[PDB]
Design a protein around this ligand. Structure first.
Ligand SMILES: NC1=N/C(=C2/CCNC(=O)c3[nH]ccc32)C(=O)N1
Length: 333
């Protein structure tokens, strides 16, 4: 098992000495190592489960990273830099530049308090620019979520408001290219982590780059509030939540979908008065009611979020367009 080969002091590839665990995911774990053959540089090594689906994803991730890193050698577009890969007791191991905490882990260690708006703006711009670079290279990420956006450096100051932690420097990088898909490749029927999953994915209408834009809109709401507006583990409940927050689904999408299981005639097959129904009614409300302030900068953020959460993936704002939105005009002064 992986536990046997991922401990502090273990040495990988006769080169990388484990000093700490950074994180764990479905794929395996990421450890911090000292690289004895690169002057003692600390690096991150992703140790992948010796399990078919995760091995395949790792091999695909390596191919994507080779492409992206050769295309953008200066990391101008802020995708994580892969250094090399190797195999260790049957596990694929991928070596990366060492980053700070994921945006998820930062929020968690901050008592699930949200980020300040000025930080959200800077983070959103960088996320959009980075994912737009993928989109320009015929790729879709498919698994954008706060766990896959990492701070370059996660030092903070703390002060009483709740005691809150505030980032010194909110610069990010995008990680995890194990699900990333090229335009001409097979598209998995299911993609994304549930809370960040686009309606065209749920309804099996076909997906491409716009599903990343949806995920980004969900991420920005979580950064703003400290929690998801879609607190569910069920697809039909997820659609019910979308309806309460964003309004009814477009007729044409309901007309076209093979996912007839979710619908009674032309409307969601949903009992407002069941346990799940009562929960959705309590937990969900129109998007703009989640605003914490009516100051114009909040209005600018919510205008962008609403465009990112457009149901129709063709109408949905692209990242190239998002980068020109008024919310970002403050960064361009
Ligand atoms: N999910 C995912 N996380 C990755 C890395 C590798 C990139 N660098 C890191 O420091 C790191 N810290 C915590 C996790 C990571 C990664 O490559 N995929």
């Amino acid at each position: 098992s992986m536990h046997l080969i991922c401990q502090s002091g273990d040495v990988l590839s006769a080169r990388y000495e484990i000093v700490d665990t950074l994180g764990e995911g479905a794929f395996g774990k990421v450890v911090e190592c000292i690289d004895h053959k690169a002057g003692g540089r600390h690096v991150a090594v992703k140790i992948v489960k010796n399990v078919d689906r995760y091995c395949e994803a790792a091999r695909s991730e390596i191919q994507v990273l080779e492409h992206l890193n050769t295309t953008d050698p200066n990391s101008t577009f802020r995708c994580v830099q892969m250094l090399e890969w190797f195999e260790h007791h049957g596990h694929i191991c991928i070596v990366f530049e060492l980053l700070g905490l994921s945006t998820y882990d930062f929020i968690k260690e901050n008592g699930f308090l949200p980020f300040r708006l000025d930080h959200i703006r800077k983070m959103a711009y960088q996320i959009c620019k980075s994912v737009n670079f993928l989109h320009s290279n015929k790729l879709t990420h498919t698994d954008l979520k706060p766990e896959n956006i990492l701070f370059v450096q996660s030092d903070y100051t703390e002060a009483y408001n709740r005691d809150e932690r505030t980032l010194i420097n909110p610069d990010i990088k995008v990680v995890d290219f194990g699900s990333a898909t090229y335009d001409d490749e097979h598209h998995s029927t299911l993609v994304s982590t549930r809370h960040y999953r686009a309606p065209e994915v749920i309804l099996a209408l076909g997906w491409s780059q716009p599903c990343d834009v949806w995920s980004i809109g969900c991420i920005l709401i979580e950064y703003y509030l400290g929690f998801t507006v879609f607190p569910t583990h069920d697809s039909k409940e997820h659609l019910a939540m979308m309806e309460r927050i964003l309004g009814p689904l477009p007729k044409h999408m309901i007309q076209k979908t093979r996912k007839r299981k979710y619908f009674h005639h032309d409307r969601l097959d949903w009992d407002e008065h069941s346990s799940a129904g009562r929960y959705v009614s309590r937990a969900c409300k129109p998007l703009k009611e989640f605003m914490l302030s009516q100051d114009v900068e909040h209005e600018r953020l919510f205008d962008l979020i609403q465009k990112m959460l457009e149901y129709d993936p063709a109408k949905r704002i692209t990242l190239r367009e998002a980068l020109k939105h008024p919310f970002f005009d403050l960064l361009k002064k």
